[PDB]
Design a protein around this ligand. Structure first.
Ligand SMILES: [Ca+2]
Ligand SMILES: [Ca+2]
Ligand SMILES: [Mg+2]
Ligand SMILES: [Mg+2]
Length: 236
């Protein structure tokens, strides 16, 4: 498999509070986080999830749901501890999206908290796997609010879940089976606020994943680059 990752401050923001990690050694897991002390929070999330998976993958890869829940909870606690040991950054928080591949490499466990996304691409069609933890997306799902005005709503990106909360309740985890030639995309909402799914799907069709990742970021900036933007692209 091939993988590429890229983060960019974008054209407007003063600093980049997104972070990411790719397991380049063994290609087992991939992480993107979007902070909001947001830089501390996203860095804690990425580091703690990485270290937890590195440590427990061997023992727990047979129970990926428990492994992922425990990794996310470790990150959550680390952020909450720093909130307590820090009045200034008392409300710091971050999203996270994680893919953990099984040993064989043709199943991706997708885990997330927040409005960063995982997508799967296949033969020029793109599917969003994760459902945003936003008050707005919850409306579209269970009630009155179309994707039409939801994508236009001003509270579009207010989070209903984030890492860094004592009362973290929801960690969404689901498996997806993979076929050769599939692409997986982990991204912060800096990408999807600028690029429609149709546009994203085109850049993902670029055979070279390093080129696809760079093109996605460049495209997000050419479209306005209003926020930090991070992508990880995996070719199966
Ligand atoms: Ca942010
Ligand atoms: Ca954001
Ligand atoms: Mg097959
Ligand atoms: Mg724009």
């Amino acid at each position: 498999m091939d993988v590429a990752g890229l983060t960019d401050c974008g054209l407007i923001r003063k600093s980049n509070q997104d972070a990411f990690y790719i397991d380049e050694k063994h290609q087992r897991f991939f992480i993107v986080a979007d902070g909001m002390g947001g830089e501390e929070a996203s860095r804690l999330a990425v580091d703690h999830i990485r270290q937890y998976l590195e440590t427990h993958l061997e023992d727990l890869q047979h129970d990926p749901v428990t492994l992922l829940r425990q990794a996310f909870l470790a990150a959550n606690h680390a952020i909450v501890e720093q909130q307590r040991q820090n009045s200034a950054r008392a409300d710091m928080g971050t999203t996270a999206v994680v893919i953990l591949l099984d040993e064989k490499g043709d199943r991706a466990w997708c885990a997330h908290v927040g409005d960063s996304r995982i997508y799967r691409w296949r033969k020029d069609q793109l599917q969003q796997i994760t459902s945003d933890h936003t008050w707005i997306a919850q409306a579209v799902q269970l009630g009155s609010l179309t994707i039409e005005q939801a994508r236009q709503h001003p509270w579009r990106h207010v989070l209903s879940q984030c890492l860094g909360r004592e009362d973290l309740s929801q960690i969404d985890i689901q498996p997806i089976d993979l076929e050769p030639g599939d692409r997986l995309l982990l991204c912060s909402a800096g990408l999807t606020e600028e690029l429609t799914d149709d546009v994203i799907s085109i850049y993902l069709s670029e055979p070279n994943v390093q080129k696809a990742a760079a093109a996605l970021v460049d495209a997000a900036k050419t479209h306005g680059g209003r926020d930090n933007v991070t992508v990880v692209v995996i070719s199966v």
